Design a protein around this ligand. Structure first.
Ligand SMILES: [Cu+2]
Ligand SMILES: [Cu+2]
Lengths: 28, 28, 28, 28
């Protein structure tokens, strides 16, 4: 169960990093 | 409990994926 | 630790709901 | 492990809080 939680957390970071790129590319 | 946390994280992940795609649609 | 984890989750739901409220206003 | 997960969730919460503020700035 713990490994499956860390997998979900890793994918959330990916989404967060991708959302940050969209915000950093709208701003400029 | 860990399995329930996993499901909630998976829903948060899908939440961020929809948020990311909407920002892409707004910007384009 | 388990109760504090659920506290952090509930706060994530709040931010997610506020983010979608910002997205709906930007989309419109 | 649970204490580290709480840190990860607290950091994700702070990421979403910053995203919310950036979206508010974009909306204005
Ligand atoms: Cu299981
Ligand atoms: Cu603050």
């Amino acid at each position: 169960e713990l490994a499956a939680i860390k997998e979900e957390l890793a994918a959330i970071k990916x989404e967060l990093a991708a959302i940050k790129q969209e915000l950093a590319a709208i701003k400029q």
